[PDB]
Amino acid sequence: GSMNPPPPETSNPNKPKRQTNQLQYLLRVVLKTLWKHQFAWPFQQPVDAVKLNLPDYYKIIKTPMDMGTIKKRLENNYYWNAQECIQDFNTMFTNCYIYNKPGDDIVLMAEALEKLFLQKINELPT
Numbered sequence: 001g002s003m004n005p006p007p008p009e010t011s012n013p014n015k016p017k018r019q020t021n022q023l024q025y026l027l028r029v030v031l032k033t034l035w036k037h038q039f040a041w042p043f044q045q046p047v048d049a050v051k052l053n054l055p056d057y058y059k060i061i062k063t064p065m066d067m068g069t070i071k072k073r074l075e076n077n078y079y080w081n082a083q084e085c086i087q088d089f090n091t092m093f094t095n096c097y098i099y100n101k102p103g104d105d106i107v108l109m110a111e112a113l114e115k116l117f118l119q120k121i122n123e124l125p126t
């Protein structure tokens with residue numbers, strides 16, 4: 001092993017494939033808008049604690065999450081419901097805010113993405 005955990009699962013081979021209009025919105029509106037933002041890149045994959053030499057990251061973070069994982073989960077129809085996906089986004093942001101120093105560039109980047117996320121979730125269809 002290494003400092004890095006195995007990445008979260010991204011497919012569920014034993015569930016039915018079922019869309020919902022909220023899951024469609026989460027992929028086509030929410031994820032796609034965040035993914036293309038200029039500050040998305042540090043959130044597009046799991047934190048590589050080995051490469052970045054962050055021995056405490058996965059000691060502090062209990063539930064790793066990132067937008068690459070979320071994207072794959074949505075594209076693979078991993079989620080049974082939209083609330084599971086919203087929870088993953090929230091976990092990603094929480095991880096960033098509880099680990100990092102408040103003034104740091106990475107927290108400014110997270111905040112820009114989070115504002116966008118929360119605005120799109122305010123417009124989540126019924």
Ligand SMILES: C[C@@H]1CN(S(C)(=O)=O)CCN1Cc1cc2c(=O)n(C)cc(-c3nc(Cl)cn3CC3CCOCC3)c2o1
Pocket residue numbers: 041042043047048052054095096099100104105106107
């Ligand atoms: C190496 C960084 C340096 N930054 S800083 C001073 O803000 O530039 C402090 C954090 N530290 C560890 C860390 C944490 C972290 C993270 O939560 N997340 C979510 C991501 C990263 C991360 N993933 C990649 Cl890929 C690069 N980085 C570092 C960021 C940093 C901001 O500028 C964009 C690149 C990540 O790294």
